[PDB]
Amino acid sequence: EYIATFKGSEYFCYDLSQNPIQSSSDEITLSFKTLQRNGLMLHTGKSADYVNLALKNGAVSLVINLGSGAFEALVEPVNGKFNDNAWHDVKVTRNLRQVTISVDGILTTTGYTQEDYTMLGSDDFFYVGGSPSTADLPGSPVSNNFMGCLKEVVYKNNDVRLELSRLAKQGDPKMKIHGVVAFKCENVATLDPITFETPESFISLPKWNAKKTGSISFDFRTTEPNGLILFSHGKPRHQKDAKHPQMIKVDFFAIEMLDGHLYLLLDMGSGTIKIKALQKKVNDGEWYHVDFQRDGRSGTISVNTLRTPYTAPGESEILDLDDELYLGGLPENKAGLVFPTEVWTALLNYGYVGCIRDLFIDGQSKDIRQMAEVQSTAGVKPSCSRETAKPCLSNPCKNNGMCRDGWNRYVCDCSGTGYLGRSCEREATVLSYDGSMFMKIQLPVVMHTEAEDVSLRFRSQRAYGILMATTSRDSADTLRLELDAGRVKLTVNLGKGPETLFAGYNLNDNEWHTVRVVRRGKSLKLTVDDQQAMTGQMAGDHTRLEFHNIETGIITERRYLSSVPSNFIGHLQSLTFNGMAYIDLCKNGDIDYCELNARFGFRNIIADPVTFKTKSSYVALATLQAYTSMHLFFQFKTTSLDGLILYNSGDGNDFIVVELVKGYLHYVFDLGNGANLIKGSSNKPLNDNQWHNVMISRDTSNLHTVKIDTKITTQITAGARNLDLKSDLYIGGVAKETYKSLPKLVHAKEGFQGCLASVDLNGRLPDLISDALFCNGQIERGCEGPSTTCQEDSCSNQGVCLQQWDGFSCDCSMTSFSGPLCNDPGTTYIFSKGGGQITYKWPPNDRPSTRADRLAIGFSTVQKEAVLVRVDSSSGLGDYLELHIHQGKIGVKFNVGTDDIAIEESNAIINDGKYHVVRFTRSGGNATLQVDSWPVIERYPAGRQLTIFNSQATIIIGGKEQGQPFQGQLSGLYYNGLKVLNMAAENDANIAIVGNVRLVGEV
């Protein structure tokens, strides 16, 4: 008996080149034992002459070609199945071009081979139980090797009788046993399926060593609409892209799901191909078989037997993958791993979740439930079950999150809720922007994308402002979202003009709105809150977008743009870009490439408040631009009942005016139909010293709207050709002589006094002071009077008072002290009995060489002789500076290359117990020394004086090296911009502390 177990990754090989088979007559015998539905039993021959025997989807398949057209047969499972793990006889007879196939004896099928040939000629190979490439050998309807036992295998022909089952066992130098080996039966088989429980779960695979040809098959089952199933790429290509030379190009293939649709993706050198593998959505929670066969430029993808052919552009036959192959998703931050933009699920972080079973690689079995299964893979579980209970009744999504029933898990869409996290349980961070603030995500490497999921939530009182934008340091291309005339505007510009969508109206209501953008290639989708989605198709065939940043607040990278959307005023929350919650990531420090001066947490915003100190103060700005609609916003605060706030005039009688009259806000205008007055609605005079918001707009239907704080007033006026205004735009008043001839219904005799803020002139945020064309009276930054200014008494220990734009500051450097008024103790160390030593050692390339030095330190002591601090140059240079006490008197001695220059404070008692401070300056040879309030002592040496303290290496504090230990207290040492004691207190790495010395605790 000749029975042998075929591992599935094993097969027999017989060389026929020493004695070629060619025959008019022949017969084949065997029995088979298998669980599996597909598998090659035997095949011989090349071009047009072959014989093929195999199990195809549970039926015995036989193919024979004698050179002239094959006879195909597929005998059927009559009464039961063949893959029943039981024995089944197979006889095949051939007389000339006539063929009888037999199953078990008596399941017959007879036909003929085509045209006229009769001679089966093959001088190449005879294969049993599998092959180097099964899907490849001619006539093969299977791509799989054999799994299970095969029996009593013989090809008898008129001349020779190659009994293959015997020759393999008894051993023949014509029989090659390629891989594995096994020689007995009653041996079983099966291979577990797998569930990928989480998106990020993934298995790494042996290298797909394809080439010209290759095959891959597997089954899947999921209910998830989106997920990357299989992916692999080659080495980077020198041959670059003319538009994005920073984008790495690679040969690759992927199989992905997008919205339930299965997709093949391939690129072998020249252009990608993207094939919908089946018309039907496949996330049915139903098993599917997937066969991928390729041969050079072409191949097929099969879902459940339904072939779909493809042909990739250009002439590149080889798909040259090298190294790893991925199943069910990808690693994050793996080094050397390129994400082609053609594969959308990869860049959208849609790792696959669902089941997979029965993998094959060029017809070779693959055992997932082991692979990296029994190799510590997170998210992978042995068998595969579909939990009956629908996950979304657990009701698990908090705070009105949308709940989606996933595979064995619920998924929450928290986007419009103010939360994030698996179940919308984590409160989302608010970032707050005042017209001058930005938050910029600088991606660690440059991004390129063909598809994006972007969402955010915002609130604004302004009808314009940037919401988010991508930017590239290398072009003007961008995907952005902005408020435009109260609507959200999406713009995609890839270098061929802007492609735009608009959604929503009147979104400047200071209420939170959620904006969701979905880009898929040329396809654009924008939806605001729960309104109807707006969709559009980009015109030009550019799709790839490059960006180095995601920007909010201000668009800061705009190198190639001479103008930009205006800055944002308002709050953002839940910026989510391809599933990255950048605001929250930034806040929590989960990423270190965020850079911002926006502020976290909600607050009511007062942007750039500015004070008109007198009624008569005012600025003139460039003319209001109110082409088509107009949207003015601003806030004000005043104690006056009456004043002109804004005036701009046009041709003819045209004008627009905003003014406070008797405490009430008046919008006066004439657009060609006569002067009109709309009173803003409030019960109380508005001059109660409180910020009030004013919004005035005129839309393209001529509806005017004045909103004062929370109250809307609308009025509709006559249809009119809208015309430019002409004069400068006046804010806070007009020139004194102008009031005597203001239009018709304008009460003003005097300008505004008080504060303006958040001034938005139909898209433009002027700095009222700096953008002024001219200016009258006083206009002061802030709403809090002027900055503090320097007085005699301002800083408190000879600290130096300095004027800053926002109040004075105090330089404490030369004092021994610290704090904002030089009134707190500087860092203090106590050196006690026995000596101590703090040493600052410069790093060897940061060794200073100065021609001017200055040094300050506070000290108390009772000692007659000590060295407090010494600064030494390196190794072999002589230069040094030393602050010491000699005979109870503080002094400095230094040498910068000429002679030792000494300077002593000869009269002041300093070893005394009490706190004293010493100040030393040096400029070349000249020097000064001051202690406390004593007159500055001055030294001017005459002669050749070298001037440079060369290559300063160390600062030693304590005197121990110099044989003269300090004992007492040293406080707040400053040397040439270094605060050596602070640095020591803060454990700077370049500070060594040794011996009896102690940091004092503050209060």
Ligand X SMILES: *[C@@H]1O[C@H](CO)[C@@H](O[C@@H]2O[C@H](CO)[C@@H](O)[C@H](O)[C@H]2NC(C)=O)[C@H](O)[C@H]1NC(C)=O
Q: CA 928: distance to chain centroid?
A: 57
**Which pair of structure tokens corresponds to residue 773?**
């064309």
Please report how close the Cβ of residue 854 comes to ligand X at its closest, in angstroms.
13
Nearer to ligand X, 270 or 923 (CB): 923
Size of the site for ligand X (CB under 6 A): 5
175 labelled ligand-binding: no
Determine the residue with CB nearest ligand X. 924
813 and 937 Cβ atoms separated by less than 8 Å = no
Residue 620 or 881 with smaller CB distance to ligand X: 881
Side chain identity, residue 321: L
Tell me whether residue 896 is annotated as binding: yes
Say which residue the tokens 């435009």 belong to: 484
Query: Looking at 111, 138, 924, 995, which residue binds ligand X (CB under 6 A)?
Result: 924
Q: Which of 923, 936, 999, 1000 binds ligand X (CB under 6 A)?
A: 923
Residue closer to ligand X by CB (options 649, 921) is 921
Please give the backbone phi and psi of residue 369, each rounded to the nearest 5 degrees, phi first.
-75, 60
CB of 874 to ligand X, least distance (A): 23
Cα dihedral 249/251/256/258 (nearest 10):
40
Residue with tokens 């090349």: 46
> Residue 926, interface with ligand X (CB under 6 A)?
yes
Q: Which is nearer to ligand X, 627 or 940 (CB)?
A: 940
> Judged by CB under 6 A, does residue 928 bind ligand X?
no
494 marked ligand binding residue? yes
Q: Is 721 exposed, middle or buried (0-12, 13-18, 19+ CB in 10 A)?
A: exposed
Choose the stretch contacting ligand X; rule: CB under 6 A; options: 376-384, 826-834, 889-897, 920-928: 920-928
Stretch that binds ligand X, among 69-77, 132-140, 795-803, 921-929 (CB under 6 A): 921-929
**Joined tokens for residue 517:** 């953008």
Q: Which stretch binds ligand X (CB under 6 A): 80-88, 199-207, 643-651, 918-926?
A: 918-926
Closer residue to ligand X in complex, CB, 35/902: 902
CB of 952 vs ligand X, minimal distance in Å:
18
Alpha helix (H) residue ranges in 23-159: none
Please report how close the Cβ of residue 947 comes to ligand X at its closest, in angstroms. Answer: 5
Pick the stretch among 188-196, 320-328, 868-876, 923-931 that binds ligand X (CB under 6 A): 923-931
- Which H or E run includes 300? strand 298-303
Question: How many CB atoms are closer than 10 A to CB 653?
Answer: 14
Radius of gyration (C-alpha) of the chain in whole angstroms: 42
Query: Residue 623 or 947: which CB sits closer to ligand X?
Result: 947
Between the CA atoms of 656, 661, 664 and 665, what dihedral angle is there, to the nearest 10 degrees? 10
Closest to 549 (Cα-Cα) out of 572, 528, 524, 575: 575
Residue 845 CB, nearest approach to ligand X (Å): 27
119 is in an annotated binding site: yes
Question: Angle CA(595)–CA(596)–CA(599) in degrees, nearest 5?
Answer: 145
Q: Rounded CA gap, 897 and 895, in Å? A: 6
> Left, alpha or beta for 639 (phi > 0: left; psi -120 to 50: alpha)?
alpha
Q: Is 983 annotated as a binding residue?
A: no
Q: Token digits for 318?
A: 């080889």
Query: H-helix or E-strand containing 669?
Result: strand 664-670
- DSSP per-residue codes, 946-998: ---B-SEEEEEESSTTTT----EEEEEEEETTB-HHHHHHTT-TTEEEEEEEE
98 near ligand X, rule: CB under 6 A: no
Q: Which span sits near ligand X by CB under 6 A: 416-424, 427-435, 694-702, 919-927?
A: 919-927
Using a 10 angstrom Cβ sphere, with 0-12 exposed, 13-18 middle and 19 or more buried, the burial of residue 711 is exposed
Query: Of 372-380, 922-930, 956-964, 982-990, which segment contacts ligand X by CB under 6 A?
Result: 922-930
On whether the CB atoms of residues 360 and 146 are closer than 8 A, the answer is no
Question: Exposed (0-12), middle (13-18) or buried (19+): which is 588, by Cβ within 10 Å?
Answer: exposed
The residue among 242 and 942 lying less far from ligand X, judged by its C-beta, is 942
Smallest gap, in angstroms, from Cβ of residue 940 to ligand X? 4
789 vs 923, which CB is nearer to ligand X? 923
Contact pick of 940, 988, 998, 999 for ligand X (by CB under 6 A) = 940
* Minimum CB distance to ligand X smaller for 948 or for 1000: 948
CB of 934 to ligand X, least distance (A): 21
Minimum CB distance to ligand X smaller for 729 or for 937: 937
* 49 appears as a binding residue in the annotation: yes
Query: Distance between CA 617 and CA 645 in Å, rounded?
Result: 11
Q: Is 653 in the site for ligand X (CB under 6 A)?
A: no
Q: Which of residues 410 and 894 has its CB atom nearest to ligand X in the complex?
A: 894
Q: Could you tell me the smallest distance in angstroms from the CB atom of residue 957 to ligand X?
A: 27
| Distance (Å) of CA 964 to CA 868, 884, 971 | 9, 9, 19
Residues 944-1003 close enough to bind ligand X by CB under 6 A: 947
Q: Which is nearer to ligand X, 672 or 924 (CB)?
A: 924
Q: Rounded to an integer, what distance in angstroms lies between the CA atom of residue 784 and that of residue 807?
A: 12
- Least Å distance, CB 924 to ligand X, is 3
| Residue whose pair of structure tokens reads 């198709």 in the numeric block | 537
Q: Is 797 annotated as a binding residue?
A: no
Beta strand spans in 539-654 (E): 545-552, 569-577, 580-581, 594-596, 599-600, 610-612, 618-621, 630-637, 643-649
Which residues contact ligand X by CB under 6 A?
Answer: 923-924, 926, 940, 947
Binding residues for Ca(2+): 49, 66, 119, 477, 494, 544, 879, 896, 948, 950
Binding residues: 49, 66, 119, 477, 494, 544, 879, 896, 948, 950
